[PDB]
Amino acid sequence: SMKLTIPELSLVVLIGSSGSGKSTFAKKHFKPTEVISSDFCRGLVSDDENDQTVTGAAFDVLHYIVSKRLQLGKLTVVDATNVQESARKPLIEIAKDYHCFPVAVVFNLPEKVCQERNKNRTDRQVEEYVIRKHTQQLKKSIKGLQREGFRYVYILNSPEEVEEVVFERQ
Amino acid sequence: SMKLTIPELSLVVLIGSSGSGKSTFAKKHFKPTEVISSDFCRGLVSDDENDQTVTGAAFDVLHYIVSKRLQLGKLTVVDATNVQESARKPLIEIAKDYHCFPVAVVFNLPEKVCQERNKNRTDRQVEEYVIRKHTQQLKKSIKGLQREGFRYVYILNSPEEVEEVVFERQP
Numbered sequence: 001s002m003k004l005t006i007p008e009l010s011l012v013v014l015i016g017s018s019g020s021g022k023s024t025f026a027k028k029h030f031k032p033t034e035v036i037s038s039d040f041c042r043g044l045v046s047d048d049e050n051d052q053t054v055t056g057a058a059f060d061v062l063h064y065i066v067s068k069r070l071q072l073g074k075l076t077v078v079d080a081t082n083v084q085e086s087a088r089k090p091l092i093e094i095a096k097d098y099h100c101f102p103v104a105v106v107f108n109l110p111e112k113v114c115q116e117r118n119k120n121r122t123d124r125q126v127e128e129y130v131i132r133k134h135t136q137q138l139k140k141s142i143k144g145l146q147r148e149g150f151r152y153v154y155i156l157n158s159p160e161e162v163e164e165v166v167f168e169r170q
Numbered sequence: 171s172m173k174l175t176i177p178e179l180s181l182v183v184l185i186g187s188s189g190s191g192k193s194t195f196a197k198k199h200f201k202p203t204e205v206i207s208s209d210f211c212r213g214l215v216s217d218d219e220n221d222q223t224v225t226g227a228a229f230d231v232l233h234y235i236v237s238k239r240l241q242l243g244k245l246t247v248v249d250a251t252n253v254q255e256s257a258r259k260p261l262i263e264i265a266k267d268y269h270c271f272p273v274a275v276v277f278n279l280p281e282k283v284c285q286e287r288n289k290n291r292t293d294r295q296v297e298e299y300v301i302r303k304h305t306q307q308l309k310k311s312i313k314g315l316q317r318e319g320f321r322y323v324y325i326l327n328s329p330e331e332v333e334e335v336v337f338e339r340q341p
């Protein structure tokens with residue numbers, strides 16, 4: 001197995017292009033209420049999970065929810081792309097605020113995989129361009145993650161590694 | 171039927187004792203995303219919709235989601251007991267902030283009706299004094315609702331009346 005160790009209380013930040021398998025993975029490994037997704041929050045504020053114009057409002061809600069969960073000592077997983085340092089920054093700050101370990105889980109997959117998964121989605125397929133951009137942003141992000149403040153940085157380099165993941169707590 | 175007319179830009183506040191059929195009613199009449207419930211918010215912040223220790227955080231979250239929705243011009247229904255004036259006040263204020271009409275839908279049913287439904291619930295049952303207290307607080311609330319800032323006050327007086335409700339946009 002690919003064992004990924006996390007404290008019983010931590011902020012797990014999933015990092016991956018659209019189509020890399022973040023939501024599927026989060027559902028496999030965590031309780032439904034431990035996962036806050038940006039899609040879900042777009043739905044909460046707008047009725048429409050695919051409404052790209054309510055991003056700011058959705059993340060405000062996501063951030064505030066994360067804040068409450070850490071305040072109360074609840075393990076939390078952020079299901080969003082998180083490929084831009086600017087998106088990760090507030091999460092680290094929140095985890096810092098509540099003295100919680102931020103943990104990076106990176107879906108470092110070949111663009112080609114995300115593109116073909118995207119091609120076969122039945123919900124919201126994105127433009128190829130989006131995944132080209134996300135993937136390159138992800139690639140430029142890996143090096144600096146530890147310095148950004150992530151206490152553990154876990155990089156998954158193939159679907160075979162992702163599939164063999166097991167989280168050990170403590 | 172019993173037609174309740176609301177504008178497209180409404181904050182619909184359900185007001186009813188535990189066991190009065192608020193959540194059931196909300197699911198029947200509104201889109202899933204239109205309904206924000208205190209139970210659901212308890213789950214968001216605690217993993218547990220029945221967790222009574224997290225009230226402050228849950229209602230903080232509910233109020234924030236409400237404000238974001240009304241700011242975006244999205245109809246919203248608050249699914250919480252709402253029998254205390256102090257509960258209703260922050261909701262009214264948020265609605266006014268974004269030029270939204272606060273609408274009260276009141277489940278003015280006999281205590282016995284809720285007590286009986288309560289004993290049959292599978293999700294979580296409350297002690298009898300809870301429903302007795304809610305019903306008395308509700309009955310004491312009715313007269314003053316319009317004055318509190320609700321633009322339309324709809325009082326439903328029996329399970330028959332509740333069952334016959336149809337919402338019409340005003341719009």
Ligand SMILES: Nc1ncnc2c1ncn2[C@@H]1O[C@H](COP(=O)(O)OP(=O)(O)O)[C@@H](O)[C@H]1O
Nearest residue numbers: 016017018019020021022023024025117120121
């Ligand atoms: N391990 C996997 N192998 C093959 N297909 C997958 C895998 N994980 C997810 N998918 C599929 O790829 C698409 C993207 O998955 P999803 O979890 O929605 O990714 P994301 O949340 O990162 O956009 C979905 O159609 C999903 O069913």
Ligand SMILES: Nc1ncnc2c1ncn2[C@@H]1O[C@H](COP(=O)(O)OP(=O)(O)O)[C@@H](O)[C@H]1O
Nearest residue numbers: 186187188189190191192193194195287290291
């Ligand atoms: N019209 C009705 N007749 C009989 N039982 C009902 C009716 N509406 C709701 N119930 C039941 O009563 C219980 C309380 O309903 P619910 O909508 O959860 O109330 P609340 O949300 O106000 O606590 C549930 O078990 C529900 O199935």
Ligand SMILES: [Mg+2]
Nearest residue numbers: 022023024039
């Ligand atoms: Mg997803």
Ligand SMILES: [Mg+2]
Nearest residue numbers: 192193194209
């Ligand atoms: Mg309910």
